[PDB]
Write a protein that binds this ligand. Sequence first.
Ligand SMILES: *[P@](=O)(O[C@H]1C[C@H]2CC[C@@H](C1)N2C)c1ccccc1
Lengths: 214, 215
Amino acid sequence: VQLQESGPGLVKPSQTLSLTCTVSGGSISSGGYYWSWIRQHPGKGLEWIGYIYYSGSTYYNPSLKSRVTISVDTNQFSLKLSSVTAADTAVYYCARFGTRGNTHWGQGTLVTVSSASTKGPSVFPLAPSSKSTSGGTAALGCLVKDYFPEPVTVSWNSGALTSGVHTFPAVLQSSGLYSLSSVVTVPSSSLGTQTYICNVNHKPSNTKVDKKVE
Amino acid sequence: SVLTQPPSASGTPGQRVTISCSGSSSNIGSNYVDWYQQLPGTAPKLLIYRNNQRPSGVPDRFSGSKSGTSASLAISGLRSEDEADYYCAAWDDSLGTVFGGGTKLEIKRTVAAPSVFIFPPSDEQLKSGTASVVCLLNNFYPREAKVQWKVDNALQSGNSQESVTEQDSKDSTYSLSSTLTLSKADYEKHKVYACEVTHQGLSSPVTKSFNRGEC
Ligand SMILES: *[P@](=O)(O[C@H]1C[C@H]2CC[C@@H](C1)N2C)c1ccccc1
């Protein structure tokens, strides 16, 4: 089974958060499986939201029971959390908890509760120089500056380069905007021929930039 | 917070570590404990269920135990890919499913000094009126590192932000990005920009500097 979350990365305060979990590789009509919602505040622990059984019986986190509805559609199930505040900013996971040990989690999706405006990121190349090269190994990267909200996804050469790649946790500037840098160490021999592109994606503002890093 | 875990744990490669989980009669004492492994940047995964059962794809290096209101997860042959947050979980008879605060597992590899790299502000950023200078501390251990910015050989402060990655699943090292942000006017008034790096893997502080416009 595979589980896929979907929803907005940004939600206004007091609005209702609606998330759906698309199930693939099996139906939602045979126990004993507990189709779950779990959330995780950024860089922190886990909090259970609720379970739903194929019969339709639900169990909720008592601290969220008054605000939460989990429902099954006639092959999806959803989470609706009303009257959201900044305290509800977290990564939300949908999962399939099996009583016989076959548990699968979804990838998780980040929800930021804020009234602030959405801003697209600027993408600047961190060009490799002699001050970025040591022992035949050269460093280069991209600077993803002044955006809101999280997250931005950075890949190198359409997902090719994975080794040596370091995408740092975004920092919250004085701007109120997030700043991020993504770097990769490559052989110095390949700086003149092999192309290195900075693939930056930011859905909340529709920003897709492919940066030739020179 | 309903279940109690130590915030951190550590062990050398090949050695064994145990992670405790303390609960009460209403959760651990009444039911069973599950364990979840969260690799950095990934969703949690089931590691242990029903106190000590392993799902498919989990090596026998991992084992769990439960006694009374306590539980314990053991990792026998520590690998670099074992670095993760480990959460115990249990059904509370009143609260439902509760978690522990989680335990970050650190692998004690050998001391590694960072490779230091510096990046002048790009010309496209300079068009915006801002100037960011990035200092890169790459693949080092332990985590503790100190960066000191120099501008025209003068020490800076309060004008930089730094960011650190999680421990790398393959070489057990950390990387650090330090970014100095100046106005374009500030940037052009000065001549030299330097990044001074202190780390126990270094016999003495390392400086990566550049004059404006070189290379
Ligand atoms: P597990 O923690 O609890 C099982 C016994 C009781 C309490 C919840 C549910 C399942 N119920 C029958 C568990 C196992 C699978 C999924 C969620 C929780």
